[PDB]
Amino acid sequence: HWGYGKHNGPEHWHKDFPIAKGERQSPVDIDTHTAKYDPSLKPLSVSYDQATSLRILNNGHAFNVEFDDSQDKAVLKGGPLDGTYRLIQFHFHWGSLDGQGSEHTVDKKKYAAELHLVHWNTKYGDFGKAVQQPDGLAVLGIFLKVGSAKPGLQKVVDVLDSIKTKGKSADFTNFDPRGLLPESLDYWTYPGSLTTPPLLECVTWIVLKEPISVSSEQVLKFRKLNFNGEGEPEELMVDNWRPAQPLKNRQIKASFK
Ligand SMILES: O=C1Nc2ccc(F)cc2S(=O)(=O)N1
Numbered sequence: 696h697w698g699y700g701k702h703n704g705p706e707h708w709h710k711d712f713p714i715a716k717g718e719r720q721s722p723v724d725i726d727t728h729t730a731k732y733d734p735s736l737k738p739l740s741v742s743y744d745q746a747t748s749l750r751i752l753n754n755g756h757a758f759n760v761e762f763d764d765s766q767d768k769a770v771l772k773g774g775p776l777d778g779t780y781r782l783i784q785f786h787f788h789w790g791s792l793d794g795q796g797s798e799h800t801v802d803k804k805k806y807a808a809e810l811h812l813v814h815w816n817t818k819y820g821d822f823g824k825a826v827q828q829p830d831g832l833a834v835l836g837i838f839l840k841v842g843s844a845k846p847g848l849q850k851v852v853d854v855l856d857s858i859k860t861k862g863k864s865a866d867f868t869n870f871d872p873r874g875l876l877p878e879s880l881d882y883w884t885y886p887g888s889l890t891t892p893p894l895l896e897c898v899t900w901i902v903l904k905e906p907i908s909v910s911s912e913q914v915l916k917f918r919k920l921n922f923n924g925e926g927e928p929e930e931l932m933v934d935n936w937r938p939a940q941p942l943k944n945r946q947i948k949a950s951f952k
């Protein structure tokens with residue numbers, strides 16, 4: 696099965712998932728000098744006041760904080776998007792060292808981690824139908840750098856010991872994802888894909904320019920998670936990031952000068 700190891704990592708994924716070599720794969724390097732300001736892009740609208748978190752799950756490649764998406768409660772709209780996209784889950788990608796971990800890069804810079812807030816287009820009715828469409832998902836990507844702690848992340852960090860291994864979940868209600876957002880919503884946007892198999896080309900990527908700061912202790916606790924299940928040999932869940940993929944015939948657009 697696919698993973699992030701030497702024999703099953705990103706360079707192998709194309710054998711089971713040939714779209715890995717497709718025309719709109721993610722992540723990508725964001726060349727800040729070539730990204731063009733698009734004055735027709737609107738401000739992002741992030742409406743998370745009614746978000747209902749339910750559960751946190753170690754799925755063997757990251758941990759997902761899942762939300763009730765059976766109603767319009769936490770939605771992303773505006774920006775490059777047409778219509779309304781409902782928050783379904785968020786998760787992170789991170790490194791074994793502070794010098795790597797993000798999936799997107801900025802002028803080849805790798806951040807310590809990257810948060811993905813995943814939303815699906817309500818016109819397709821559910822997530823499973825949305826991923827079959829070129830405009831089915833909108834993923835808000837936020838870089839993490841190591842410095843001061845992020846207070847709004849600590850409730851996540853503190854539950855990780857209860858979901859150490861693949862397949863473990865824990866109740867995780869009343870978590871407010873607004874506490875994970877930077878001050879500015881300036882962003883880059885481009886059409887891309889899921890960054891894990893099945894690598895479907897269904898994502899409008901919206902990557903925020905401003906990183907959030909998290910403490911060394913916070914990211915160190917991400918690195919204590921396990922890829923393996925309980926009672927299997929311990930493999931630390933680190934370096935669960937796909938590297939940048941060829942941009943091909945795409946343009947990255949900036950919301951800001
Ligand atoms: O690792 C990732 N796996 C995903 C899997 C399913 C998604 F809906 C979105 C993503 S993602 O591209 O945001 N990141």
Ligand SMILES: [Zn+2]
Pocket residue numbers: 786787788811890
């Ligand atoms: Zn992701």
